Ligand binder design. Structure first.
Ligand SMILES: [Ca+2]
Length: 490
């Protein structure tokens, strides 16, 4: 028995957790096993490991009969709220106030986080993934390629065009072949963010395709005329091969592939893991130098960094109405917000991935010297996963090299990061319109966006049909309630 046990009698619960379109909960994970040992509660996964879309899996689970005991994953906030009000997920307010002292304290000191996860009916239907940090992404460019081609760091979009064209046509890796791919990215959604170069927004926060506010008015990036004009430019860059032709399909290992084979010239991604490639590829590609770059001056005369860490994220886990042990479950959930629980969910397992030295968790050299980014290494053993947990930036600091640190400092110092959208508080009736139309409009917007970038549809010629479809699909009904809810707060 352990003082951390949340139940005297061993308890096993079923969890459906499919995340980042590639992973599922693994009861064999070192972290899962350690938490089970300490709490006496074991979670067994029931998600389909042979599936490449996490949202589709949530929907499939919801239509495959009786739900499991717990459901977790990334980008599920809206589903947790929608189905929570439908009775599929239970309210946690009471359970927390009565059995979770760590969470109760956390929320008292983090009122903004509590508000962000609360539903229109005032109920909390899930515990969020709470990131720790300030900046997230930044632009990175191949300094060695710039040097080899005698080009200066691009300061404007026009200068950037010239530089990327040079990367594509001037054989910077010197193998006599036109194999270079100027701009690459792990996230297909980043291709949409390129409209920033032409003064248009792509999202209001770290949450993909989120709304934003301008002069007291709620707006959505994909519906603005600025997007039409901006995406036309992105389409041109894609047409000319300045943007990875496989940008919508390569995905997850784009960096390992393109930087690893010395064909990638630039990206926009997280500072720590991206800068790590300088160390991982130092042996195979001497001179490889991927460095942070300030955003180029855009068509509106400004340097924009649209992304920032979002606290909390629309990720996490919830308790279903079929869970027969809600009290034991919330106690398990609370364990993660305690000192030991937070340490495990962030660093892995003591003696395996880290050791306590001078009272502080310190990653082993084998982890820090690995070619794989530390967050990827954590995913592999059940840490840094999108359950309800509190991220600790100290875990990240340990593998943020000087190149990354200096990039982070530059972005913080020069204030490139745009104000982030912190959401609004919808009434129950307003939420009904949101859940009825938004999901499908969002999917439609992505589809149109991809068509415009790839050239299968001309944004200029299809814009009217598009706006008509947005109206028919309920987009403006959603915009109307969003604005009303906004005016209530401010
Ligand atoms: Ca070449």
């Amino acid at each position: 028995r352990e003082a951390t046990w949340v139940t005297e009698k061993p308890l096993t619960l079923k969890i459906h957790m499919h995340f980042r379109d590639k992973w599922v909960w693994d009861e064999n994970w070192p972290v899962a096993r350690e938490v089970a040992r300490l709490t006496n509660v074991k979670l067994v996964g029931v998600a389909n490991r042979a599936a490449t879309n996490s949202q589709e899996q949530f929907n499939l689970m919801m239509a495959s009969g009786q739900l499991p005991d717990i459901v977790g994953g990334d980008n599920l906030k809206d589903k947790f709220i929608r189905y929570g009000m439908e009775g599929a997920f239970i309210p946690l307010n009471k359970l927390i106030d009565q059995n979770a002292p760590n969470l109760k304290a956390f929320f008292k000191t983090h009122p903004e986080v509590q508000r962000a996860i609360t539903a229109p009916d005032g109920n909390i239907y899930y515990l969020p993934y709470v990131p720790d940090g300030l900046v997230s992404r930044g632009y990175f460019i191949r300094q060695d390629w710039l040097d080899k081609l005698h080009l200066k760091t691009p300061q404007t979009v026009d200068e950037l065009y010239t530089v990327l064209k040079a990367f594509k046509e001037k054989d910077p890796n010197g193998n006599g072949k036109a194999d270079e791919i100027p701009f690459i990215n792990r996230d297909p959604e980043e291709v949409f963010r390129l409209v920033n170069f032409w003064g248009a927004r792509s999202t209001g926060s770290n949450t993909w395709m989120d709304f934003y506010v301008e002069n007291g008015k709620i707006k959505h990036p994909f519906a603005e005329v600025a997007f039409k004009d901006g995406i036309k430019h992105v389409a041109q860059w894609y047409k000319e091969g300045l943007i990875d032709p496989e940008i919508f399909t390569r995905k997850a290992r784009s960096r390992e592939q393109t930087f690893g084979n010395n064909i990638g010239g630039m990206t926009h991604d997280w500072f720590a893991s991206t800068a790590l490639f300088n160390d991982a590829l130092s042996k195979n590609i001497p001179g490889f130098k991927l460095v942070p770059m300030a955003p180029p001056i855009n068509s509106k005369g400004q340097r924009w960094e649209e992304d920032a860490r979002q606290i909390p994220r629309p990720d996490g886990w919830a308790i279903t109405a079929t869970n027969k042990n809600p009290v034991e479950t919330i106690k398990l959930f609370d364990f993660y917000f305690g000192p030991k629980g937070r340490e495990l969910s962030n660093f892995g397992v003591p003696g395996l991935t880290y050791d306590i030295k001078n009272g502080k968790p310190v990653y082993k050299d084998t982890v820090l010297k690995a070619a794989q980014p530390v967050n990827n290494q954590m995913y592999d053993i059940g840490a840094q996963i999108p359950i309800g947990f509190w991220q600790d930036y100290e875990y990240e600091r340990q593998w943020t090299n000087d190149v990354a640190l200096q990039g982070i400092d530059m972005y913080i110092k020069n204030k490139y990061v745009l104000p982030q959208f912190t959401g609004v508080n919808l009434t129950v009736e307003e939420r009904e319109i949101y859940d009825k139309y938004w999901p499908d409009v969002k999917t439609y917007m992505f589809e149109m966006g991809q068509s415009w970038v790839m050239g299968t549809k001309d944004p200029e010629k299809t814009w009217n049909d598009y706006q008509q479809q947005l109206k028919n699909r309920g987009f403006y009904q959603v915009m109307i309630v969003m604005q009303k809810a906004y005016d209530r707060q401010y």
